[PDB]
Amino acid sequence: QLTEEQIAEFKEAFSLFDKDGDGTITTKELGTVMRSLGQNPTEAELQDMINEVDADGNGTIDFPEFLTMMARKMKDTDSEEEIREAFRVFDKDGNGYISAAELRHVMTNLGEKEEVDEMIREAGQVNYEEFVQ
Amino acid sequence: HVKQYYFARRGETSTHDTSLPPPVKVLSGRSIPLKEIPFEATRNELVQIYLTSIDKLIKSNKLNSIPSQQIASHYLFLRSLANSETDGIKKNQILSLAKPLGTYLASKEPHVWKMINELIEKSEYPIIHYLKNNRAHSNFMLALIHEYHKEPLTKNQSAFVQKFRDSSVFLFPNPIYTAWLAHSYDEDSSFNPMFRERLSTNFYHSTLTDNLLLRTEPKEVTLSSEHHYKKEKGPIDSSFRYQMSSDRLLRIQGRTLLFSTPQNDVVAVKVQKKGEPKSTLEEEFEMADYLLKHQRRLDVHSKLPQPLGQYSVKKSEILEISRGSLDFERFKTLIDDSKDLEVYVYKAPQSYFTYLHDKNQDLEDLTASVKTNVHDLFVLLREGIVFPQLADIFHTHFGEDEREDKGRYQALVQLLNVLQFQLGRIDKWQKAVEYVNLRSSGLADLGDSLPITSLFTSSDFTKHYFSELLTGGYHPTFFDKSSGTANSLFTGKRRLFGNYLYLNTIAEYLLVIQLTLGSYGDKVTRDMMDKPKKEAVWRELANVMFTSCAEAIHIMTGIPQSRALTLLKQRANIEKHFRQTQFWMTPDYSKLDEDTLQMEQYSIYSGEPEYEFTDKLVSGVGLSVDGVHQDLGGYNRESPLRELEKLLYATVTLIEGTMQLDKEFFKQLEQVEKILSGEIKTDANSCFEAVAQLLDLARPGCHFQKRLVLSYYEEAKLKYPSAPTDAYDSRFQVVARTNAAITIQRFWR
Amino acid sequence: SKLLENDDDVLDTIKYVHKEYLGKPYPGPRLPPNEGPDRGPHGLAHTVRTMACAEVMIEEARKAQLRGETLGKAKNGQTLADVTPEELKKILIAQAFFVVGRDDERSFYAEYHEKSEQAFRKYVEDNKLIGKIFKDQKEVDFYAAIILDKNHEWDATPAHILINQGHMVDLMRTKAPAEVALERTYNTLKGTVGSKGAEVVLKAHRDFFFATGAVVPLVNPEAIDDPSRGGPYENPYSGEKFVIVDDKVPASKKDLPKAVNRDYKLKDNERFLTIKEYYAFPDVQQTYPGYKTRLEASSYYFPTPFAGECEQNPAKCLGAIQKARSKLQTDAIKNGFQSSSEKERRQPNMDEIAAARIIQQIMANPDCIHDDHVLINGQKLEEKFFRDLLAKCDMAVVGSLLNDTDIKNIDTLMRHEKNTEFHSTDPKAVPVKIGDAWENRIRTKGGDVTQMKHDLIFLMQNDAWYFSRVNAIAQNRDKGSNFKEVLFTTLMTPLTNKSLIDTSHVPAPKKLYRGLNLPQEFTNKLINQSNAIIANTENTLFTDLSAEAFKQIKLNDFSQMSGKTCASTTKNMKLLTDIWGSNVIFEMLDPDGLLHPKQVGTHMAGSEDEFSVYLPEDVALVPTKVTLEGKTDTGEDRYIFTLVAVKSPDFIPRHESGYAVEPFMKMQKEKVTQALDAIEPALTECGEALDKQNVTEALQALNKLPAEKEKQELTGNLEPLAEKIKVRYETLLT
C-alpha cells in the first residue's frame, strides 16, 4: 500500500489540479501533477500514460485510478541513488560530514517535526552511506 | 473499478444579475433608483491617490517626522506593488518612488533596514509577511492620504473608505490581498481581526470576507444530463402494497408509522400531511432511489432508506391500525383530512429514527454519527444538492411575514444585509433542532432539497428569503441629490449573490451541527452533579464542532484535515468556545445575581467585552421572550456565542480564500510557462521574477506546489545559464532543503 | 483623565507575569520561607492595585492642575501632570515587573530586585518590544534601572515617583500604628499631587483594598474606641518616637523635643508621646485634614476567599478595580444633591390636566384654530401660551393623559390644515403642505389607531422638514416660526409620546448614543464646561467637597440640549460614527433606569436599535469624561462626551403655577355664563340659580364649585382638574 502522508499529498494535488471540481483531471494537466509530485516523466513515457488509460475516449482520470497510476510509477522509480540525493543536498563538504545536531535541527524545525532523540541514537561525523544501510 | 466523480462542474459567468427584481425602492410612494459603486475602479484610483501622496511626502522632506514603522510599511508596500505590476513604465515609476525611502532607511535607521532586507530576500511581496500581526491594524495608506491629500474625496472613494477603514490590506491589489489573507492563518501568524479603540472593541472578521468576495467572479454550476435534476424520471407507478398490522406497530412519530420486521429493521409509512401534495412524497421517493443507486460513486456513508412504494390508502384504515398508539390524537390532527391519503413506504434501520441529539448515545457514537452526517452533507453539496431545511432556526417571530428575511436565521447576516453588524439571537434554539433531519445513521429527510443552481438564480427560495440582497441596498445617506440615485457598494452584489448564498449555506450547515451538539450536551448534563465530568462533556463537544468545521474545509478545498484544523485554531479559540457554549446553552446562569453573573462572565470572555443584556431572566430557564423556552441572546441583542461566529467566518473565509489563491497561482503559472516555452520574449531577470512570484502565491503549509515552482526555477536557470540569481537563491535553497528533509523523513520507513 | 484598562499591552504583560512568576508560591531565599509559601502580600493583586494607584495619581494630578493649583516638581522639573499616555503605558509595563523577582518576605532586597530585573530583560527580549513598544535600548535600560532601584533616589523622574509612591501606598496596610502611617502617606502624596488629590488617591486605594478582599486596620486619631490605653506615636518608616516630661506636655508641635531612635529606655518615670495627644495639637489640626477621621475596619481579619479567586484570575481583579473606580466617580457626582425616592415618571400635576384637556378640545374641533390664535368659547390662546406650555409642561405625562380619541382626531386636524411648514436648519428647502403630505404619503390606508400611532412615529423619525422645525420649536431655539407650526409642535409632542409609550414594549437599554453636528466654537464651550465639572468631582477621604461639586454642576450643565424634545438615540455607536457622520457624540449612561427609552419601530435599515428619550424634569446629564476619537470624514475633530443621568429634586425648575389653569378657569366661567344666559319658573328657578350664580366667583378656586353643583359636562370636566440644603448653602456663603 501507500503511506498515509503520501495518500494525503496525492489527494491534495489531485484536488488542486482539478479545475472544475468534478472529481477528475484531464490528460493535459496529468504531466503537471506528476512533475508537482516529483515524478517528472519523459515525453515518451508521458505520451504513453496519456494514450493508454485515456484510450477509453472519456479522457478523464478519477482519484482511485490516479492512485493506481502513481503506485505503478513508484513501483520502480526511486532507487538508492535518488534516496541519497536528498542526503547529499546537505553535503556542504565532499567528505560526507554532517553534524548530528544539524540533522536534529533540520528534521525538527524544517520538516515533519521527540522522534529525533531516537533517530540520532541509531545514527560527530555522519557518513551518508553509513546510515542508508 | 467504479468511477468516483461528481455530476456537477464549476465555472464562471459574467453576472448573476439576470431575471431578478429591478433595483428600486418604493419609499413613501416615491421610486428611488439604486446604483452600484465599482469596487475595483475605486480601489485602484485610491491607490493612485496614495502614490501621488507618497510623491508629495518625498518632496516635503519630512521623513524623519514619521515613525520608522510607517516608513518601513510604505517602503515594503511600494516594493510589493512594483513587483505585482506588469507595465514597465508603472513598475519603474513605483521603484523610483520607493528609492528615496530606502536610502533614508539605510542611512538613519539600519536596525529596521536589516529586517526589511531579510523580508525582501524572503519573498516577492514582503508587505504581507511584514503585516501578519497586529501591525495590520494600522492604516498607513489611509493616514498618508488624509495627511497629504487636500482635495476632497469623491462620493465613491468616501464610501469605500468608510466601509474599509480598518486596515490597509483592503487597498491591496487582488493577488497581494489573497496571499496575505491566506498567510494570515499560518503557524507563525499572530493576526486577529480585532482591535480595541478607545471606546469599545472593533471586530471586523466579516469585513475580510466581504472584501474577498467583492474581488471574485460570478460562479456557475453546470449539472450533467445524468443529474437527478436533469432527468425526466418516469412514473413511480408500482404494484407493491404493504400489509398494515396493528400488532406489529412499533410506534408513531410525527406523520410516520413505524412497524417492526423479522429482519430487526423498521418499515416506515409516511402519511400525507395537510397541505403537502403527492409531489412531495414522489420527490422523496425519487431522491431516495437516486441516492441509493449512486451511493458508491459519491461515497456516502449514511445508511440510506430503501423505498418500497408510494400509493394511496383509505383514511379509515390508517385510523383503525393506529388506535392503540399512545399518540393517536396528535397523529390524527397532523395527517390530511381527505378520505384517501397518499403514503410513502420505506425500510430503514433502527438508528435512522433516532435524532442526532438523542441523550442515549455515548460520546464516541455521537462523534461517529456527526462525522458521517457532516461528510454526507458536504459531499452532496459538492454533488449539487442543497438541504435548506435541516432544522427550523428562527431569529425572531414578531414581524415575521413583514420583514424581508421572513424571520429566518442568516449565519452570515453581515454579508447579506445593509447595516447589519453581528449575528442576532436564536429564538427557542432547543426546538429548532428537536426534529432535526440529521440522525444517528445519517441524513433522513432527503426529499426536502433543492438544486444548487437554485442559489445562483432568482428561484422561489432565493426570492423568498433573500430579497434585500437580490433587490439592492437603500439608506437615506446613500441618496445623491445631483443624480437622484442611491449609490452603495451593497447593490454591487447583485451580480455576485450566488457566492454569498453558497457561503451562507455552508455556514448554516455548520450552525445546525452546533445547535444539535449543544442540545445533546444540555440534555446529557442536565441530570448530573460531578462538575469536572460535566465540563469534560462540553470540552468534547467543542472538539467535535472544530473537527466538523475542519472536515468541511477538507471536503470543499482538499486541504488535509490536520492542516485545516491548525489553520482554524489559529483564528478561533477552542477554550473560549467551550466556556461560552457551556455557559449559555444550560439554565444554570439563570440562578445567579447580577454581581455573580458578571463575575462569571469575566472568566467566560477572556480579554473581550462581556455580554450585555437588560432582559429579565426567567427562573430555571434564562433568556426567553415567551417565558417557557430558552433562547440564545437577549431580545434585540446579538448572540452571546462570539467564538461560534468567529469560527463560522474563519471556515467560510478559508474555503473561499483558498479557491481564489488557487486561481491566482494558476494564472501566474500559465504566464510562467508561456515565458519559459518562448511565447513571451523577456530578459532573464523577468523570468526569475515570474518564478519567484509564482513561489509567493503557493498555498501556506503545502509543499508539492513549491516543489513544482522549484522545478520551474531550475528549468529557467537552464534557459539562462549566464545570469546572476543572488536574490532568489536563498528562498529556492530553503525550498530545496525542505524537499531533501521530506525525502529523508519519508524513506526512513 | 485616562483609563488604561483598555491598553492590550498592559493586559498581556499582566497575563505573562502571572503565568510565569506572580502565580507561584515563594521558593524561599534554599531556606525556609519566613511566612511560608503564600505570595499574598506581594502577589498579583498587589501589583494590579499599585498600577491602579499610579493611574489614579496621574488623573488626579491632571485634574488638580486644571483646577488652577501648583503641584510639586521632581528633580527633572516635570510635574506628574505632564506624563503622556504612551509614557504611562511604558511606566505600567515596567511596574508590572517591580516585585516579580521576590522569593521571600524577609526585608536580600537587592537580590530580589536583581532577579526581577532579569525577568524584565527576559520578557522585553522575548517579545520584540524593543522596536515596537519601546524606542531603543536606551529606554529599555532606563526602565531596567527603574526596576532595579539600586539607589533610593525616588524623585528624579515621573516614573520613579509613580512606582515608588504606588508601592508605598499599597504597603501602607502592614504598618503597625495605622494613624501615623496614613499621615505620612498623605503628606508624601500631597507633596506631589496636592491636598484634595492625596485625599482622593487614599480613598480610591482604600476602596481598592476592600474590592480585592484585603485586610485593612482601624485608624483612630481620636482614640475613641480605646477607653484609656492610647498608642505611642512611633512614626513608622523610621521607628522614631517622642519622650515627654512628667507633666509638661507641649501645647504645640513646635515645642516638642528632638526625635529618639526606636531603641530607647525610659528613665525618671518618663513616657512616650501618645497618638491621641499628638492629634490634639493645634498645629496638626490646622495642617492635617484627617485629624478626626475614623475609618473603621474590615470586618474579616483574614484575607477573604475572593483574594484567592483573584490570585489565579487577573480578569476578576481587574474587573473589581474597574467597578470600584467607576462607582467612586459616580458617588462623587451624586453626593452633591438630594436622593431620589423612585425612578418612574412623575404623576400628573395641576396644570398638566388642564393642558391635556385643552389639547383634547383642540383635537375635537379644528375650527377653533385661526390664522393667528385659537378660540375656545371666548378664550383667545396666542403663541406665547403654547410656547410657555411647551417650556413648562412635561409632555410625557400629558401624552399619557390623553385617551385614544386624539390619535384618530389627528385625521380631522390634518384635513382642516393645508398650511405651510418650513425646514429649519437650512432655508433653501421647499415648503411642504403638512396636511396634504399626511393624507397622501405619511398616512396608510386602513389600519386602526394602533396604525396611526406608528404613522405618527414614522413621521417623527423621518421627514427632516418636520422634525427639524419641531425640535427647534420645542427647545426654544428656532428662528422665525409662525403660529400654526408652534401649535402643531405643542399638539404633536404629547401625542408622539403617547404613541411611543403604547407601541413600545421592549426592555430599555442602559447605554444610548446621540449624534450632533456643531461648530467648533460650541464644541470648545462644551469641552470647557465638561472639564470644569469633571475636575471638581472629588471623592475625598477626609473632607467633604459636595458643595463645590453642586455649584460647578449647576453652573455648567448642558443637559437642556437633550430636553423638551423626543430626542432620538441609537444603542449602536458604529451607526453614528460610520454613516451618519457626526462630529459630536453624547454617550448617555442610565444604570438606574431614569430615562425610559422607547423603541422607535420604523422598519428602516439600521433603525431597529433606535430609541426615543424624553428627558424628565428632574434628571440631569452630568459629564464624566471627554474623549477625542479620531476625525470625521471631512477631517474635523470628533469628540465624545460621556454623560451620567442623575435624578434629584435639586434639578426641578421652579415654575409659577396656574399657567394652564387660569385660561382653563376663564373657559369654565365662559361656559357657565353661556349656559346661564341661555337659561333666560322664577320661584322654582331660584333653587338652581343660586348655586349657578355662586359657582361663578371662583377667581382661581376649585373646591366650592362641585359643592355648588351637587351642565353635567362642566362638572365632569372640573373633576379631573432640609439639613443638607442649609449645610451646603452655609458652606457656599463661608
Ligand SMILES: Nc1ncnc2c1ncn2[C@@H]1O[C@H](COP(=O)(O)OP(=O)(O)OP(=O)(O)O)[C@@H](O)[C@H]1O
Ligand atoms: N419525531 C417526532 N415526534 C413528534 N412529533 C413529530 C416528530 N416529527 C415530526 N413531528 C411533528 O409532525 C409535524 C409534521 O412532520 P414533518 O413535516 O416535520 O415530517 P418530516 O420532517 O418530513 O419527517 P421525517 O424527518 O421523519 O421524515 C412536525 O411539524 C411536528 O410537529
Ligand SMILES: Nc1ncnc2c1ncn2[C@@H]1O[C@H](COP(=O)(O)O)[C@@H](O)[C@H]1O
Ligand atoms: N436573520 C438574522 N439572523 C441572525 N441575526 C440577525 C438576523 N437579522 C438580524 N440579525 C441581528 O439581530 C440583531 C437584531 O436585529 P433585528 O432583528 O433586525 O432588529 C442585530 O444584531 C442583527 O444584526
Ligand SMILES: [Ca+2]
Ligand atoms: Ca475535472
Ligand SMILES: [Mg+2]
Ligand atoms: Mg424532517
Ligand SMILES: [Mg+2]
Ligand atoms: Mg420533511
Ligand code: NA
Ligand atoms: Na431579536
